[PDB]
Motif scaffolding. Structure first.
Motif, PDB file in Angstrom:
ATOM      1  N   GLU A  27       0.821  -1.203   0.000  1.00 25.93           N
ATOM      2  CA  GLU A  27       0.000   0.000   0.000  1.00 25.93           C
ATOM      3  C   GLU A  27       0.859   1.258   0.000  1.00 25.93           C
ATOM      4  N   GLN A  28       1.778   1.354   0.956  1.00 27.35           N
ATOM      5  CA  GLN A  28       2.596   2.552   1.071  1.00 27.35           C
ATOM      6  C   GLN A  28       3.498   2.720  -0.142  1.00 27.35           C
ATOM      7  N   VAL A  29       4.038   1.618  -0.663  1.00 28.46           N
ATOM      8  CA  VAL A  29       4.912   1.761  -1.820  1.00 28.46           C
ATOM      9  C   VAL A  29       4.112   2.241  -3.025  1.00 28.46           C
ATOM     10  N   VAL A  30       2.872   1.770  -3.147  1.00 25.10           N
ATOM     11  CA  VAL A  30       1.990   2.264  -4.192  1.00 25.10           C
ATOM     12  C   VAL A  30       1.773   3.755  -4.026  1.00 25.10           C
ATOM     13  N   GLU A  31       1.591   4.195  -2.787  1.00 23.36           N
ATOM     14  CA  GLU A  31       1.261   5.594  -2.557  1.00 23.36           C
ATOM     15  C   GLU A  31       2.424   6.491  -2.950  1.00 23.36           C
ATOM     16  N   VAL A  32       3.640   6.089  -2.591  1.00 26.33           N
ATOM     17  CA  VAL A  32       4.789   6.908  -2.969  1.00 26.33           C
ATOM     18  C   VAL A  32       4.978   6.893  -4.478  1.00 26.33           C
ATOM     19  N   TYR A  33       4.695   5.763  -5.130  1.00 23.66           N
ATOM     20  CA  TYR A  33       4.792   5.741  -6.584  1.00 23.66           C
ATOM     21  C   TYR A  33       3.797   6.705  -7.204  1.00 23.66           C
ATOM     22  N   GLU A  34       2.596   6.772  -6.641  1.00 20.08           N
ATOM     23  CA  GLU A  34       1.606   7.715  -7.142  1.00 20.08           C
ATOM     24  C   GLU A  34       2.062   9.144  -6.921  1.00 20.08           C
ATOM     25  N   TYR A  35       2.708   9.399  -5.788  1.00 23.46           N
ATOM     26  CA  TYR A  35       3.222  10.733  -5.512  1.00 23.46           C
ATOM     27  C   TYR A  35       4.251  11.138  -6.553  1.00 23.46           C
ATOM     28  N   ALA A  36       5.147  10.215  -6.884  1.00 25.05           N
ATOM     29  CA  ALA A  36       6.159  10.509  -7.886  1.00 25.05           C
ATOM     30  C   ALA A  36       5.528  10.736  -9.246  1.00 25.05           C
ATOM     31  N   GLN A  37       4.532   9.923  -9.595  1.00 22.66           N
ATOM     32  CA  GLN A  37       3.845  10.112 -10.864  1.00 22.66           C
ATOM     33  C   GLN A  37       3.148  11.457 -10.911  1.00 22.66           C
ATOM     34  N   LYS A  38       2.640  11.916  -9.772  1.00 20.72           N
ATOM     35  CA  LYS A  38       1.976  13.208  -9.730  1.00 20.72           C
ATOM     36  C   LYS A  38       2.975  14.331  -9.933  1.00 20.72           C
ATOM     37  N   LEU A  39       4.112  14.256  -9.247  1.00 21.20           N
ATOM     38  CA  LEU A  39       5.126  15.285  -9.426  1.00 21.20           C
ATOM     39  C   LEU A  39       5.657  15.292 -10.846  1.00 21.20           C
ATOM     40  N   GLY A  40       5.742  14.123 -11.463  1.00 19.59           N
ATOM     41  CA  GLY A  40       6.120  14.030 -12.853  1.00 19.59           C
ATOM     42  C   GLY A  40       7.513  14.524 -13.166  1.00 19.59           C
ATOM     43  N   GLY A  41       7.589  15.652 -13.862  1.00 16.53           N
ATOM     44  CA  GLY A  41       8.834  16.119 -14.428  1.00 16.53           C
ATOM     45  C   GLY A  41       9.908  16.414 -13.409  1.00 16.53           C
ATOM     46  N   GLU A  42       9.691  17.443 -12.597  1.00 20.53           N
ATOM     47  CA  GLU A  42      10.695  17.883 -11.635  1.00 20.53           C
ATOM     48  C   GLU A  42      10.724  16.898 -10.471  1.00 20.53           C
ATOM     49  N   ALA A  43      11.315  15.741 -10.744  1.00 17.80           N
ATOM     50  CA  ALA A  43      11.432  14.679  -9.760  1.00 17.80           C
ATOM     51  C   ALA A  43      12.840  14.113  -9.704  1.00 17.80           C
ATOM     52  N   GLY A  44      13.537  14.112 -10.838  1.00 15.50           N
ATOM     53  CA  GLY A  44      14.824  13.452 -10.902  1.00 15.50           C
ATOM     54  C   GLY A  44      15.970  14.285 -10.395  1.00 15.50           C
ATOM     55  N   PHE A  45      15.803  15.597 -10.356  1.00 17.22           N
ATOM     56  CA  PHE A  45      16.863  16.510  -9.977  1.00 17.22           C
ATOM     57  C   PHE A  45      16.857  16.856  -8.497  1.00 17.22           C
TER      58      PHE A  45
END
Lengths: 362, 362, 362, 362, 362
Positions: free
Chosen positions: B282-300
């Motif tokens: 559940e929690q790992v899914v939630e963080v993945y969704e958070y990253a998908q929401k942030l989208g672009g400015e995530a890798g830097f």
RNA sequence: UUUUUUUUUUUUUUUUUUUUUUUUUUUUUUUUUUU
């Protein structure tokens, strides 16, 4: 189940990022490049016809002349529009027809010329004189030339632009490597034209075009949109019809690996059951979906320096790339594609499988 | 049924909290760091070209010089804007070109120099003198140098910034560990440049850049936004092309575990049926969704000291982390990633499963 | 149908009640606790550095000193503001730097000291003398110390506040029980610091902090808001980054049962089909919704004596609490949580189910 | 359709009626009950501490003393305000500290006492003497007592008020029935206090409180608002928290049937499809909406003689009451609730259904 | 559309008419009925206590005595005010306490008596003598009576007024029919009182009250407003809560058919689709809206001869009345309501439907 | 005409907290043929 939503679309995120960056770098040279209109097309066609009928002429500025023909066929406002869409800071040095006076070897003569920041009336009249001389020579030894042998006929610019399309085909590599194949194809076709006219130096024209495209790049986008518009129309002569086939043949450059992968798929190469590619399946699917979404304007990216083309390279997927390469080479069609795999074992295995599978083909 | 709404989004709540905190801490040193404009780019490029053609020069301030090239390519107001967005309290020591007089060994000579709070006209003229000396030496034994061998050519700053991108790649670890791989790649590419010029000390340039980034951090954000803007453009040379690929290759640092987890998912590792990870699903899914929401400015994020990056670490999910590590190691790709699992049993089990599954791969 | 609106939100009603009560009780002691400003931070950092480099010093007032560092880093007005929001009736004994004269053993010497209602110039100079003595001793047997070994370096207060965060982690229980685990973690990390300096008595520092927090509570809120503000910033060093991770690790104390219940949900424990918990489903859902509504400022309640935390305890739901406990214990993760269930039968049943379900885990 | 507006809100109409009645009945005795202020709290706390440390003291006026502690903690004006809001006609006999002289057994001694219309300096000094005697006895056989064993410590009044909360819990029935459970819960906790002090007679304290509340009722409202105000605050100790939890545990007395009905709803008892309760659905919904509207100040009504509490009794809905009773008894939780149903058949049916449904619970 | 405004609100028009009639009829007898004040309440309570402790006393004037208690509890001016609002032409024969001398059987004794136009000192002293005699007899055979067994206790008037409320319950019919149920309830409750005292003749008290209300009606309004005011207060005892519950239980008499119609609505009786009631839907809706508008003062109309109550009778809607009757009788709750329907067919049909619907109730 | 029966309410159990844990760490430019 819950696992299906564990995903990460780095490609889409990069796309969004590069689409919206908030900042810009500028050169803004401020050039005053020329632009003609519909009027001078006839004079320019006559000029190209002179430069075609004349023999062994120095086909130096021929690519420039063809680009001017293209801009005249397009329109001032349309050229300016596409340039501003491309993001330029240039001006429109309007073209104007005029007569030039020159006491040629004791004879004052009138000379049709156009004011330009890149041309010279001297070389214009030189071209016209040489054309006239060899034209009257051609009139000798037969008594008369046909209308399809004189500069007055209307297919000259299209004849040049055919070679231009042959060059923009291989400009993807763009290192003067494909010149041989270009000449080969240009002799495989246009035999009628090569016998009907004589000022045909394919290598020289191609070198001229290479210089032009290497220096001034905006002409690339110009020629591209010109060919696209010409293809969409249904009007034109035989040359215009061939031109469209040639231009469209250069669709999708720097993307061959995708189609070869589709090929190896359709052949059902056994090696794709390997886990080392079953893993990367997801990302390769995602990029394929991205390409399908972009649809039309996808093949002309690598032609340009458009930065979004780097996404569409499976070189970062080494196992997939190597197996596809081995498959295509086992099919005996990868003639001289100077590529390389990563997993040499997978490459050799797929090649062996394919060549085994072909010889026993029912 | 009713159970579906029993949830707790601690990640989103932490995000909201840190976004709205009502208070701030300040240093506000009040520095007067320099900023040039578009004008002096030519002088700076010539300087970099001198420092490149010259042999065995002490590439000490080269990173600083490249950052100045970047700021000049960007613009005064834009640099100031991004700095204020970053939340600084600094000033703009404007740059100004000028001549310097120096009776060099019995000869008064003019010397192009720029007033700066970091540079010295002495070392400037030293650089120019050394460049001139070895340049005339290069003119010896051949008679003439090509235009692509002199300081006047325009690709110098981009050549340096390529190495800068190679360094910001590994700055995530940022402990002078990746220098070897950096040198390896910098020799794997740029061979044309390494033969065309000689003042190339990759290790020294990298050490200079390390010092610069270790001391003054704001240049990090500067260089980042500069690379982003350069990538979004399309009008550039071959070097500008390579630079963009290099810069984008450093996207998503300190996030490799997510992608490796996606990998182990796509391989269908049996061990994920274990309850000890089905729980944390559940929690790992939630963080993945958070990253998908942030989208672009995530890798830097991990590039910077941005505090919100700690969310995106699955080290707090020990079972999941260990199984993913074991899977990736069983695939024989985790070369030297100095990580560690928690459930050594799960790690070894997944590794054994993977290596069993590969050898029997059809 | 009509049954859906038969409801009773006792939690929300209690919340409204306690929010609006119309009356207040007051102590209003009238203390004159000190508050520094940004200026004396350097002197205080030097002092902490002396107290760190010195060996086996009586780390008695260290927690006080760290709180003073925090208030100086914050600001007079901001501290006063948060105290008034907390509802205090205290005053601001302003701090002032000054020199102290003392004929030390036949030598008049100047001594940097600060006027305070808690400190004494005597112990200040004692600290300084001991630091000087062992510092010159450290200069012996090596000839020179590095800059990262002297009191002048700037990371001392942050080093202390890291331990402060480790303590506020376990202050929820707050009975000097977690001291062992605190020491264990403080040795698991900070090894670099433990070798770089020597005045590190983790147990003594922790006891000092315990005394400070047991007596003066307002420093709790001070330290909390300080850590929150520091985390929201990004401009920092290694120690500052570690501090933020440590501080955020103590989010959500006295709320573990909620997350463990989510865990047992995600595992799909069969026992929740029991009517004895299907009943209480409604109220537990309602409190979960309340927590989701409060969002951010939810985890720090049990840290304080905030009266609204008693709502968020599922001890009043005995069946649910017992089944969750049994599930978590069957997973073998409830190490030493000194809790208790109510329905021992349900507890044992869920534990048996879980341990049965793990061993046969595919 | 048109039927939806056929309604009759007798509850709301009764509410409006009783809210606006235009007339009033009065007793207006004219009493002169005392009221202290913040000053004498210390003396009173010392007195309670004496009465706690002393053994087997006649805890007769202890409830009165605790109420005086409460009024002192509150404030003269606030007490008077709430009394006038309650609608009283009493006066404020101000309290005053003073010394009393008494030649105790041949020794003139000073005695701290307070003038009151309910106390006597005689019994005050008796209490003080007994406390002193057993305190010096406690000093014997150990040499010294800790500060947490003497009357000077500050938690005494709160210790008494904890028992007061335990009593106001069961005062709803208020027939000296719950005394046993009260004692059981006073031994369930406060074990630390029972070992730290000795003058703890829970039964005697409870009987004293019962007498006090049976005679003077206004102290009920006093204690209520006091507990509410204390709970809303946060600045406190362990005893203060304990007290708040205990006080809030007595929220919603004489309203248990509503919550049990919600319980039987959440269990989905089949019997509610019966027409004989589907009829009364409307009115029960309406009263539930009324309670939801009143919100906060709803649970403390039955504590008082507030006349509006009779609305919130589902005894007038016999079928609903009986089915809920049968359900709760089938769940085996209605321990000794001396209630009664009306439809014994429905009661037994629901009980049988529930017990059938639990044993086969998956 | 246009049809919606075709309406006729005969009820509202009748209301307006009767509210504004411009004329009045008068009797204006000019009586001089008594009125006491707050002072004599104690004497009257003692008298009622004597009349309660005494056995088998002729409870003849008990209702009068209770009304005098009520007027004394109310106030002279308030009684006069409500009487003038009721529209009377009476006077205030003020009451006065005095002693009476009587040589009882050779003994001059003082006798507390009140001057009144209805009472006689003779019967007063007779009552007192009988009370004294049986009181000393009660003192025999036990030695002493408790304070809750003597005339001095304060609950006597409230004890009588409880029976008064039980009577005003059934006074709607008011034909001495409900006396049996009254006695039944008065024995179902008040068992504690029936054992604590002995002068309890419920039938005789009820007959006395019936006589009083049949002759002098204004006491009805008196008792009504008295009960309303007592209910609105909260300061009371067990007898006061009992009395208030009893009084409020008699709210809404002669209006039962409305609530039974709401019942049959909530059960969804199929028969209301009949056109013969779908017609009358409009008018019944209108009267329901009228009742909702009047709100509070609606249930006490039929208690009085208030002329506006005739509106609120659905007997004029025969189909609706008959179907509601049949429904309620099919539910088996219309015990002995001596009503009658009109459409016997609809009545029987609805009854059959209901009894069919209950037996198959899931 | 109208009204028409039944009935006070309350009643049990219980303070809350309690564990483990900084994060990072690898490799990599892309393009390359035939019509």
């Amino acid at each position: 189940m819950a696992l299906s939503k564990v995903k990460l679309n780095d490609t889409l995120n990069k796309d969004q990022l590069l689409s919206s960056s908030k900042y810009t770098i500028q050169r803004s040279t401020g050039d005053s490049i020329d632009t003609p209109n519909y009027d001078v097309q006839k004079h320019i066609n006559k000029l190209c016809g002179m430069l075609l009928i004349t023999e062994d002429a120095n086909h130096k500025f021929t690519g420039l002349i063809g680009m001017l023909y293209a801009m005249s066929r397009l329109g001032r406002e349309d050229t300016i529009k596409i340039l501003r869409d491309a993001g330029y800071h240039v001006k429109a040095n309007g073209v104007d027809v005029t007569t030039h006076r020159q006491d040629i070897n004791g004879k004052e003569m009138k000379f049709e010329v156009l004011t330009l920041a890149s041309l010279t009336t001297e070389i214009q009249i030189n071209i016209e004189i040489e054309s006239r001389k060899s034209y009257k020579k051609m009139l000798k030894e037969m008594g008369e030339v046909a209308p399809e042998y004189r500069h007055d006929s209307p297919d000259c610019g299209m004849i040049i632009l055919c070679i231009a399309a042959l060059v923009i085909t291989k400009l993807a590599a763009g290192d003067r490597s494909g010149l041989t194949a270009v000449i080969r194809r240009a002799n495989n076709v246009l035999k009628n034209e090569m016998k009907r006219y004589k000022g045909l130096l394919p290598k020289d024209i191609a070198n001229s075009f290479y210089e032009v495209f290497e220096k001034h790049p905006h002409f690339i986008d110009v020629f591209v949109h010109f060919g696209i518009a010409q293809s969409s129309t249904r009007g034109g002569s035989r040359v215009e019809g061939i031109f469209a086939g040639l231009f469209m043949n250069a669709y999708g450059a720097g993307q061959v690996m995708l189609r070869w992968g589709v090929l190896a798929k359709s052949v059902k190469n056994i090696m794709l059951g390997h886990a080392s590619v079953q893993a990367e399946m997801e990302q390769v699917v995602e990029v394929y979906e991205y390409a399908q979404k972009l649809g039309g304007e996808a093949g002309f990216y690598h032609i340009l320096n458009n930065p979004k083309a780097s996404l569409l390279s499976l070189t970062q997927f080494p196992h997939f790339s190597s197996v596809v390469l081995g498959n295509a080479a086992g099919l005996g069609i990868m003639g001289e594609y100077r590529g390389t795999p990563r997993n040499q074992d997978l490459y050799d295995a797929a090649k062996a499988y394919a060549e085994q599978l072909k010889e026993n083909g029912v």
